Every structure is written in C-alpha cells, then in structure tokens.
Amino acid sequence: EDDLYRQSLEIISRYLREQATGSKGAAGRRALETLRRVGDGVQRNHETAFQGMLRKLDIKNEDDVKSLSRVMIHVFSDGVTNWGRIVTLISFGAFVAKHLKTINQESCIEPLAESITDVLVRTKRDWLVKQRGWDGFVEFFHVE
C-alpha cells in the first residue's frame, strides 16, 4: 500500500545488491544513477574511515541486522535531516553489504535494505515528502 516505502526499498535494495555483487521507473532510474555517482564517491573518499567503523560495530554486535538502523537513529538524533546524511548512511549500508557478501557469497542484502528503508520512510516520511522525495534527491545532487 505504501508507495513511498516500496519505491525507496526498490532503489536502496538495487543499489546495495549492485554494490555487493559488482554487477547491474524513470524516476527510480534517475535516483539510482544519482545514488551510484554520489554513493560510490562517499565510499571512495571515506573507505579508510568506513573500514575503521565496521570493525567496532562488529565487536559490539554485528549478527543483528539492526546494528545499522541504530547508527542511523543516532545520526539523526540531533534533529537534523538532510540529503547528505541520507546518502551517507545508504553508502555505509552498501559498504557493509559488500563486507557481508565477501564473507558469504550467499548473504542476502534485503534485510539490510529494509532496515535502512524503514528508518528513512517511517521516521522521516513528511520530510521526504516535503523535499519532493526521490525526485528531490536527484535534484539536490545533480550538477550538470
């Protein structure tokens, strides 16, 4: 029933699977392309930091898919919402998804994608709607 939820899950799960495996509507297409360009950039620029992060989380938890969602909740806990945060969290999700596949090629990224989508859509719904959803995301990052 939830259009925004399904759309978001489609985009985020597709990105995480592409990233984890390394192989590949119109609004969704543009969003995914933007996510690829910006997200691959976050991962390139912050690879060292991301590597440092995932280990710490692993020592405390891993095993629980919910590890990432809590990190997301903490990021947003100062009451600020922006697309930089949203794309950075998705990018870190892709980094974690890559790691999970590296350990086990039959790992599924779907629970991770759902976790990320749940936080964004359920807890930031009206912000997303006001900001024109995934269309706004594309327009925020488009340069030329």
Binding site: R85, L89, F92
Partner: peptide
C-alpha cells in the same frame, strides 16, 4: 565516535552541495 564522526562526513557532503 562512529555516530558524530558519519554525521562530519554527511553534513560537511551536505554543506559541498549547499
């Protein structure tokens, strides 16, 4: 910490994109 130092890279990306 992990929280604040994701929230560094996110806000200081957000404020590249004004």
């Amino acid at each position: 910490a992990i929280x604040a130092x994701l929230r560094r890279m996110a806000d200081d990306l957000n404020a590249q994109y004004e």
